[PDB]
Design an enzyme around this catalytic site. Structure first.
Site, short mmCIF file in Angstrom:
data_model
loop_
_atom_site.label_atom_id
_atom_site.label_comp_id
_atom_site.label_asym_id
_atom_site.label_seq_id
_atom_site.Cartn_x
_atom_site.Cartn_y
_atom_site.Cartn_z
N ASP A 122 0.87 -1.17 0.00
CA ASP A 122 0.00 0.00 0.00
C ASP A 122 0.91 1.22 0.00
OD1 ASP A 122 -1.73 2.14 0.47
OD2 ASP A 122 -3.02 0.99 1.82
N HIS A 175 -5.74 0.40 1.21
CA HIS A 175 -6.27 -0.92 1.52
C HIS A 175 -7.35 -0.85 2.59
CE1 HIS A 175 -3.45 -0.50 4.87
NE2 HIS A 175 -4.04 -1.53 5.45
N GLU A 229 1.21 1.85 13.46
CA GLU A 229 0.16 1.82 12.46
C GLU A 229 -0.98 0.93 12.94
OE1 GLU A 229 -2.27 0.93 10.18
OE2 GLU A 229 -0.98 -0.05 8.69
N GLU A 282 -10.28 -3.67 15.03
CA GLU A 282 -9.13 -4.39 15.58
C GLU A 282 -8.73 -3.89 16.97
OE1 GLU A 282 -5.78 -5.06 12.90
OE2 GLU A 282 -7.06 -4.44 11.23
#
Ligand SMILES: COCn1cc(CNC[C@H]2O[C@@H](n3cnc4c(N)ncnc43)[C@H](O)[C@@H]2O)c(N)nc1=O
Ligand SMILES: COCn1cc(CNC[C@H]2O[C@@H](n3cnc4c(N)ncnc43)[C@H](O)[C@@H]2O)c(N)nc1=O
Ligand SMILES: Nc1ncnc2c1ncn2[C@@H]1O[C@H](CSCC[C@H]([NH3+])C(=O)O)[C@@H](O)[C@H]1O
Ligand SMILES: Nc1ncnc2c1ncn2[C@@H]1O[C@H](CSCC[C@H]([NH3+])C(=O)O)[C@@H](O)[C@H]1O
Ligand code: NA
Lengths: 343, 342, 343, 343
Positions: free
Chosen positions: A31, A280, A123, A132
């Site tokens: 990405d 993404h 990240e 998440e």
């Protein structure tokens, strides 16, 4: 530990098995917007890294740590909980950076760092930013941050906007109407048609779209990573009051997010907006169970409530109402299981 | 339970969570070859069901139980461990078959069945037949089977054959070659390339292909569900000796399977072979990291060894050899995580 | 020893002049219509640069350029040729009744003795990627026979280099090198030699033609002025480059071609081997990277192409390239004497 | 040494440079007939290698030594004169055969072996068997062979046969007639047409052909490597008398060769005949300057005389005559510089 208490073991296993794949790391690494912008944000703010102590939360392959090393960092602690940590270590050795990067296998909530760091890089963004629940790890890691320490990224903006997309809405019923037949091989399936519709509408839709489907200026919800506590992300209430720019049927709310690297030299933005080149993360849309009609100039008000669950995601509650008519719609979605629609 | 001891909690949670979705049921139900052949096998062997006791292992929405009910079964116990069981109950009520189909929620290894059955029906086949390790549940269920009872399907044939497909091979090799770069954004990744190639090639490729890529007559491995024991599927050793019909590069082994419903009236076959109309099982190919060159007339020898793991699948080891040259290849694949190429 | 023998291995020289002793090779060169035609136009359309002049033809071969000089009215032409072809050139001189105008002098131009200084030097000393065969040094060495205002045909030479994408070529070579990747070729593990194999194959410049759309940036030009350059200038040739990428994609290497200009009194005539121009027997030359560099449009690809002359009448080529925005770097070493003829 | 005295230094350099390339070794290794047959002949005669001392002349990559190792050899001396020797060392180490295969860098005529061997293996065959003159190196090696020793291959057969190929014969003149034009860019080239024809006919043609052009059963010349001397190959006189099977014009002689591995268990043949699958040796054809007409039943008699030169090749002298008519033709060819015609 703090991680295990908020996470189902079955979810954690799956989660870290997923990031144990070199292909999954590769997918993120390729990405270019993401990786390139991170490298840019770090190198262009080299004064924030030169001879500094750095913490990389969830380093994966270790790419961000290498970017930090390129920026002249003195010591980088690269923490990674999946088995990818072993692959990161190999890279540190093969890149002759064992004196500057220390890979620490394990969860950032459980490992120990020998010293406090000057800056934390990470990240941790998922779909709709919050998926998440890794932002909480990122925030948890501030126990290792020196006072006056910095965070890369520093802030995160999630954007919400109402959209019209007749095809997307009708698509759900087209798929669910499979069950609306009286003799599938002699079996009447009709009684499950409702359950099928319900199932489809619980899935947030991951993909991209034309910005012309957006019917109002986005509403923004900001997380300041320098100030926020992990517990702040357990219950996220996003009030909204959209002023409709176009007349039509509102089929739901579209989501995207930006993050900012606020450095001493400059602020660099990483955006996943539909006006920007695709990443993404794409964009996420949550449909209303029943569309809402609005006139241009009307106000669409309500709340998007994100409730964290132990499957490392959020239960999404959306309530919306056209103030001028009182026409109301709500939806409950399960962010852990989105529908990847992008083709 | 037998299931729990052989299965990681982490795997079972995900596994049955997956099958709780109506969209997945729709996907399987829309495999017309499958559904039609099952219905065909049950209805045309109606005497095997008429006023008999039936067990449906992993009934899902309950379709096979409805087929058994159509064949005149007196009582059908429909066992499903996922939440789909609740949807099955709904269909039974709305189809007015409450007196004949009894949904029993839970794993077949854990539920209690009210009586012994005359026949077991199931759809326990996964990719390459053995994926998901549900065949063992199917076999486990024979504890509820009467002494001369029957099983639908009755036997399973796994077919393997060497194939040539440069495009597929280069396609995977290209993906692994990302980890070849000496300077990805200034970073040397090359030291991981070996691990990367290993990772990609461990993925069996699920898709279909033209039968002309096949370089030899298939070798058959048969499991008789009437006779087999659960333990028989913990270690599956399939030796092979291919007589090469074409010269070229052997890039790996292609796998597919047939199952037969051996009933009293007729034997009905359900095939997933590449010569047959496509099913949702497609076909499976296991690539060699390094292809073996073979000439027509050569013999390709070796072993395909399947080892069951606690993640409801198999560790696949393929060792192959060109006997005339001694060219040997070894490969390890993780059947749990195939690459869906279709 | 002369300047030629000292810079040339005897083993190389033997093969070299033995190669050019063959009439088929002369035929091959003469059948290049673009080449021969352009030379003849450059000489004939600038006839005043030859009229009643003294000419030196360096490496005359069959003598074709001397005949062109004679057609343009030269008074006397000294045709120097070191291979046995000199004998055949003499046969043509006699059969064409030009003994009073063309004098064939057999031997190396570095070793022969000329009776007088010349008004103009003609030659065709260009090899692959311009510099191969190292004859430009002979051409320049011959300037010792040139009157102070003398002219050079060709007068200047331009080498063009530009980055290209060609996955087909790269995989073609990579596949050939991957033979040594086999762990069991007839039972033998060859893999330990793959690195050496990759190195060997990628050291070969690829000679052939290609579509111009594979070029990802404007060519960078390096100019040699034959009127000013000295032999020693070609011993070590350093060509810096800074490409502005016009397209995004994988840079698999650098493409090379060259132009020469005949700057005459009447007009300047160009002979080009560019891929935008009609094909010549020089084709084009491409140098592959072992691993391609990813670049986005707008990025700059900078670095250096260093050519070091060797005693085998060729060059050791070093190419260092870098995507400035990411720090992605590639280094490569090539052997120009042993190219891969792909056409 | 024996090698240096019979070999020009310039030739030896290029010769061993040629075999220093992994690609050339690979080219030989990818000849499945050749390599497979060697492996097969060694393995099927395993009693000839079991716990034996083996000498591999010109091991190249070392492939034949590994085959000897597969057959159970106790010690294998792999002699190699090119730089390939180091790559062989790499393979020996990487295959864990360091205690059984010893790589010796250098020429077999110059190195020292510690002990006598039971069997010598080698692949010394060139075009029409004798090109490259390596069989002399092979025979020279018998100084290290025990009296009861064996040679792999054991014998070599050269086959010669008359052929008709009107196209091939006419092709020479078509190519030479380039020079037969009075104004090539104003130049009369015709005076060189004869020299051009001469040049083409000196080159043996390397390629394959349909067996339908062969006009008689081949005449065979056999070298028994167990019995022969080096000197036996300095002057090779091959008398021939063909019994013509077809009527027509004989344009020259076609050449190919077989080798036999006569082991204790069985004899294995490696053939490069045009009736057999193509190898990297192809076949070789030598043209007569003027074709000979012969009827079926006529006899075509004469001599093919191969005279070894110091360029590691042979000057080929061919005299042929149709006995019934007395019609005679000759040719002198340079085997060192063949024309590769195969497409
Ligand atoms: C790759 O193909 C997937 N696939 C798998 C299958 C296998 N059938 C699985 C169906 O059986 C269920 N199941 C699996 N193990 C079970 C067990 N111990 N006890 C009870 N139900 C079980 C599971 O929840 C699902 O409803 C199939 N019949 N068709 C397919 O298409
Ligand atoms: C790809 O081939 C490049 N190339 C090179 C050339 C240049 N060579 C032309 C002729 O130059 C001759 N030559 C080379 N170095 C020489 C030297 N010190 N002194 C005298 N003659 C020399 C040599 O015998 C040959 O016949 C050409 N005329 N056409 C080509 O195509
Ligand atoms: N609590 C945690 N402790 C340590 N690592 C974690 C935790 N949560 C997530 N991770 C890892 O963080 C990574 C997020 S993906 C980002 C990968 C890499 N840093 C890059 O920027 O390309 C994954 O590899 C996860 O395994
Ligand atoms: N006199 C010599 N001494 C040693 N090696 C030689 C000599 N002449 C030729 N060679 C080598 O012999 C080899 C011939 S090619 C055969 C290579 C290998 N044995 C195979 O069968 O694949 C080349 O590698 C040459 O370098
Ligand atoms: Na099929």
């Amino acid at each position: 530990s703090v991680f295990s208490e908020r996470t189902e073991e079955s979810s954690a296993v799956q989660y870290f098995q997923f990031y144990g794949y070199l292909s999954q790391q590769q997918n993120m690494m390729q990405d270019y917007v993401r990786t390139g912008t991170y490298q840019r944000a770090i190198l262009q703010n080299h004064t924030d890294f030169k001879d500094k102590i750095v913490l990389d939360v969830g380093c994966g392959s270790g790419i961000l740590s290498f970017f930090a090393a390129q920026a002249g960092a003195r010591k980088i602690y690269a923490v990674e909980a999946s088995t990818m940590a072993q692959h990161a270590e190999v890279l540190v050795k093969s890149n002759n950076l064992t004196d500057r990067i220390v890979v620490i296998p394990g969860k950032v909530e459980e490992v120990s760092l020998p010293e406090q760091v000057d800056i934390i890089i990470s990240e941790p963004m998922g779909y709709m930013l919050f998926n998440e629940r890794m932002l909480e790890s990122y925030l948890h890691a501030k126990k290792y941050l020196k006072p006056s320490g910095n965070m890369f990224p520093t802030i995160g903006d999630v954007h919400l906007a109402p959209f019209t997309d007749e095809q997307l809405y009708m698509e759900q019923f087209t798929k669910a109407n499979f069950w609306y037949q009286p003799s599938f091989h002699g079996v009447d399936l009709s009684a499950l048609r409702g359950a099928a519709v319900d199932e489809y509408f619980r899935q947030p839709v991951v993909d991209t779209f034309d910005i012309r489907i957006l019917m109002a200026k986005s509403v923004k919800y900001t997380v300041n990573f320098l100030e926020a506590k992990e517990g702040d992300l357990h219950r996220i209430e996003i009030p909204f009051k959209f002023h409709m720019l176009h007349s039509g049927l509102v089929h739901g709310l579209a989501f995207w997010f930006d993050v900012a690297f606020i450095g001493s030299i400059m602020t660099v933005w990483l955006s996943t907006a539909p006006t920007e080149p695709l990443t993404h993360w794409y964009q996420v849309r949550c449909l209303f169970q029943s569309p809402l009609f609005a006139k241009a100039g009307d106000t669409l008000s309500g709340t998007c409530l994100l409730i964290a669950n132990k499957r490392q995601s959020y239960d999404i509650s959306i309530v919306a109402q056209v103030d001028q008519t009182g026409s109301k719609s709500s939806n409950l979605l399960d962010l852990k299981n989105p529908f990847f629609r992008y083709t």
